[PDB]
Amino acid sequence: RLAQRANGPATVLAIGTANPANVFEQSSYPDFYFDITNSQHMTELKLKFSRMCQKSGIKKRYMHLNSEILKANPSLCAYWEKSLDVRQDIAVVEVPKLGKEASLKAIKEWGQPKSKITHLVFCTTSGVDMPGADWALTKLLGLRPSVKRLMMYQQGCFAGGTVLRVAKDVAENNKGARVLVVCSEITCVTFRGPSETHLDSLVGQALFGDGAAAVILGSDPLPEENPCFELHWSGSNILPDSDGAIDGHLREVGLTFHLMKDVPGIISKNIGKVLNDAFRSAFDESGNAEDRPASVNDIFWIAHPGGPAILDQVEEKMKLAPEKMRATRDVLSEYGNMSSACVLFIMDHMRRMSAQNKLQTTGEGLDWGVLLGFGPGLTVETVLLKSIRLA
Template sequence: MAVGPEVHSAKSSADSNGEHHQRQDAPKSQSKHHASILAIGKAVPPNRFDQSTFPDFYFGVTNCSHKVELKQRMQMICDKSAIKTRYLILNEETLKQHPEFYTPGEPSMEQRHEFLEEEVPKLAAQAATNALKEWGRPKSEITHLIVVTLSGVSIPGADVRLVKLLGLRHDVQRIMLYMLGCYAGITALRIAKDLVENNPNSRVLIACSELYASTFRAPDEKYMYDVVGASIFGDGAVGVIVGTKPDPLTERSLFEIRWAGVSMAPETAHVVQGKLKIDGLNFYLDKSLPMVVGENITPFCKKVMEHAPEHLHLSYNEMFWAVHPGGPAILNKVEEQLKLDSGKLSASRSVLENYGNVSSSSVLYVLDEIRRRPAKEEWGAAVAFGPGVTLEGVLLRRNIDQTDS
């Protein structure tokens, strides 16, 4: 698809469903140099679990094999999860060393944080190293570092530890994002976009690192979300490098970030909650979440489309979509509400199938999946959801001449 100069107008334009909405004029001072994603690298722990047999491991390692009915309920959840494999840093050996992680009533917050303050930056460093290797330029050129995790908190934080592990400059400008949830990978892209477009020649390294160990505990009939969480969450990290004006000889733009924004669904703070308690991070996820996402996804995506070049007249089905793979019900609801063709969310479904829900890393895993596929659509969006209920999204333009094989 040929793309000419952007046209900004206050006129209304039709969206993918034939409806009209006001376009927003771009500020006159808008930078002509858009932020670009220059490299993506992933990392997972060495322990790979088959979803079909995970209940055997989970109930066995927590000494709960006698809870036959509850195990059967978990098996049903796993079977319907659309997940085939996941990666976890916890294994039988680690849990033998830390029985407090799953012993009911046993305080474990201190032990979990000691474990996570080491493991979160280590996995982040692996992903960041892979991104830096792909980027191919000296790490001394990294000017900003954004670190994202839902897994544990510490002072100094994972950002400080990551600077040391990677050997980054001591004056690298750091941002540490704790406890945001599944949308935080897009939050990091939004912040990185602002940084590089307002700081010429800067390069931002994003590192998201998520470990389920913060919430792991023994199954209990009274707390079914612990069982649900154990059935869908996986561990993983991702590194992303963002900059403007890529050097044509040494850098390449995988995706231009044309717009980034966020919105909260009103009166939905109760739908996704998490609290730090003596036995770790306790999550609550209301069963209404897919419905809430469904009710708000179309208005949010209309907002995203207001920032696409008007002359293209893009419909949702003419775009690629990187949607947070929180679960099959959420993906189905997004597909239904946006009236997407079958296969439009195949990259999200692939990540869910192979990694489970990896919280903030997930949607960036989906972008990595998309950039490795043959390019069809030049324009697209990445959207994620989390506590608030918050919707974060970016409008992207793909460099279709630089598809990875």
């Protein structure tokens, strides 16, 4: 061919993460949030929010927004106010900044020159600009000017799966390709003051946090590179009877989510079939039936923690051992819902805990695993993973 292809499976060769420096402990967030938005007098609504925070599964989050910025930009503190211009101004610089920070850590781990990066996949649901955040990152890092970019704006919470699905084909179909994959998510586009008329917004204020994660992906690893996971199969599903379950509109008041169905119920009702169909396709239909794991407790799990009820209902319906959701719940606890970045943070946490506890593989000692993104559609993104053996 005029462009050669790679031989082996796309492999994760490094993972780096970054967060803003301002930490918000969840136990004191209702006070902070109702104070800074001049809403301290809304006693009933504040109690409702306190209960939301107490039930969130979150201990702390990191956010770029803090008191000084919010005081200087009162349209962000209002409960429903035209404010997109300010939100855009913040997002168009902070999203690639946080992405740069994560990327530098990934590249340092990887240990290869940044000039060897041939492709970039950048994902965010925080703002849009032309050129996009992919271009900004390319400039900030000094990547080769011929880097081949895939800019994925406004997809929401499932896109941690999406970027891996997309990057798999890039890595596998291009000999020598090394793909930088970045998810960077920040809450400046959704932050607003509290009101009873915008309760979906209020739920987001209990859950969403800031973070970026960067992966180096490539097929046919060099001896100097260090695999930690392989991508082996990907799929997408729009779940039945889920129209309008999660909508998000970018308006002059900022990004506004509207949820209209029982998201945990829909996900947990259908996830068994999603997984059976995925593993049947990956193993049975490819002539590798013998290698198919015997149950969902015999694989490792990386699930998007959109809220704790999703995790709880999936665990119950699928009869998961109590440890299956542990790595996922740890990231929810320590960072909150960072949208697309969560599953990459969880992947990093899992490989690090597996090494720390002297397990046999990067996937909690198990060979195969599933990574799941959940978001608007209602879309489930599924990626089947293989672990890498540890000393």
